[model samples]
Target chain A: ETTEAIRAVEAFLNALQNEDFDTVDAALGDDLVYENVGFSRIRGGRRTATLLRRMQGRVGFEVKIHRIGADGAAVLTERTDALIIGPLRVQFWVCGVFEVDDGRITLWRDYFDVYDMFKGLLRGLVALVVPS
Target chain B: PETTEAIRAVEAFLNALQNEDFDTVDAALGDDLVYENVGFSRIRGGRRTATLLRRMQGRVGFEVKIHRIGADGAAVLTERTDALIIGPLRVQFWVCGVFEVDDGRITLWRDYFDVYDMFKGLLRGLVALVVPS
Candidate 1:
């Protein structure tokens, strides 16, 4: 049962790699609530789907899965997600938890340090100001 | 075996960390333990992590509120207050900690938090200075 829950999350992460909307859509429950750390909550599968689609278009994601542990309904994943936004590339170590209901993801919450990512961008901004 | 031992291990760790019980903290950790925090540095082994924690306790104090402990003892969902007494500013963070126990001691201790929210709390005075209310 726990293995099934882990696989459910894997399918969802796998769906993120492809541009196939249905694959991602199918993995989410109708009342899905997805949350990103330091960001707002996105409710409903339709809105979540749109957000995922928009996010994938803007950034290139290279995910390295470290561990996935599931205990019945709760599935947790620890990974390093390398994101490429145009020429700026940054990697974040992420820990995400998902609540699986009947083989579909109902709740998604991920934690990361957005400060490091912003700091990287701020360094570029400083370079632009000083031009040295 | 996994449930009782794992929960006990984490509880003891939390207690030791809070009370500055370095010996108990050191004893509770496995030799091969790996602890990671996304916003901060990662440390390996029981002794190194214990040394780091002891040093850290002098700078900041922590109060952990365990929200839910998973039945499988794989994780604990917690809210923590990390206080740095430059002045009085209260901040709380929702943390999900993953634990891997092997032979009744913690082998892996990983915690997750939001850095942006943490900074907002830390920089409250600065923001209040810039923008008058």
Candidate 2:
């Protein structure tokens, strides 16, 4: 049971990175609630699918899973996400909690440092402003 | 086997923090414990983390409401309400903590939170000057 839940989360994230829409859909529950925790809340599988599809071409991501553990229906993952956002490459150290039932992810909450991302982006802006 | 030992350790730590029992808190952590807050901050060593915990709890009170604790005791997900009585700032957060237990003590702890939420809601005007929408 625990192994299945863990795999579902891993597959979901991998599918998102690979832009595999069909796999993404299969992994998420019908009543999925995916939250970025202070950034965005995507409720329902349909909405989450739309968001993933929209970001397919605009952003690319590389995830390095630092640790993953499962307890009953819950799967916890700690990782670093390196994102290529437009012309900039930013990274976030993230802790994600996932609740999986049967074979689908019901709830996904990702916690990360928004300030770190902004701080990195701000540095890029400063270079453009001052021109060293 | 998984939860019995790990959950007890975490519970002891939480209880120690709530009751201001520094001794028990220190006992619950491993010698080489590394507690990190994602990219924002980190504190290493059992002694240093204990000292910092005391300072932080003294400055602004910590009240944690644990929403879900992993059945395997591998993680604890919580909603925290922290306040500074000296000021008008009160911060609420959803924090997820991952733990590594070794020999019945927590050796590694990593917590995740959004610093933007802390700054924007905790000190609204000050953050606006730095982080513009």
What total of clashing residue pairs does each candidate reach? 0, 0
Error of 2 at A104 (Å): 0.3
Q: What is the lDDT of residue B132 in candidate 2?
A: 48
B1-133: candidate 2 lDDT, tens digit per residue: 3335566677667667767788888888888999998997888898889887877755665555565665232333334443233233445555677776655677887777777766665675345446643
Candidate 1 local lDDT, B2-25, one digit each (tens) = 345567788788777767788888
**Docking level of model 2:** incorrect
Candidates in order, TM-scores: namely: 0.44, 0.46
Q: Kindly report the docking quality category of candidate 1.
A: incorrect
TM-scores of chain A across the candidates, in order, are: 0.81, 0.86
TM-score of chain B alone in model 2: 0.74
Off by over 4 Å in 1: A119-132, B1-133
Looking at model 2, residue B103 earns an lDDT score of 52
Name the weakest run of 10 consecutive residues (lDDT summed) in model 2 chain A. Answer: A123-132
What fraction of the reference structure's interface contacts does model 1 contain?
0.00
Q: What is the DockQ of candidate 2?
A: 0.02
